[PDB]
Copies of this chain bind each other. A is one copy, B any other.
């Protein structure tokens, strides 16, 4: 309910510790278009314990929601947000076309296409370095074979 959300290029990550994880409130903000849990039960959330809890939030397209799952590929998975092959959690997604859409174009939310390799689980990618696709290098200004990675 922050009324503001970040892109998958700079997805937020909140620390959850020294607090009572009251999971009885998440049912009041979204209709749960895609509520998929992997390592835990939807009802046993209030009857378990964990070492540390992390809540990652970002904005992606509708076709990219299926990539937020263990063992998935794609631009969001391999280059923006990678989940481990043994992830134990729940994924929550809901439509935001009524709130996060602008008639003049909401160019705020971005995403990285590909940067020379795939990413590791739970890591950031904020380096805005120019991407090189050819044999001759290039820096500073974009151009032929020197495309922005976003």
Instruction: Using CB atoms and an 8 Å cutoff, list the residues of chain A in contact with chain B.
Output: 24-25, 27-28, 31-32, 35, 41-43, 73, 78, 113-114, 117-118, 133-135, 145, 147
Contact = CB atoms under 8 A, between A and B. Distances in A.
Contacts of A31: 147
Q: Is the interface of A mostly helix, strand, loop or mixed?
A: loop
A30 to B, nearest CB: 10
Nearest to A136: B28
Nearest to A35: B113
Contact of A73 (B41, B113, B135): B41
B147 A43 contact: no
Given A32-B147, A113-B35, A135 B41 contact: no
> What is the total number of copies of this protein in its complex?
2
Nearest to A147: B31
B135 A24 contact: yes
Given A31-B147, A32-B147, A41 B78 contact: yes
A99 to B, nearest CB: 15
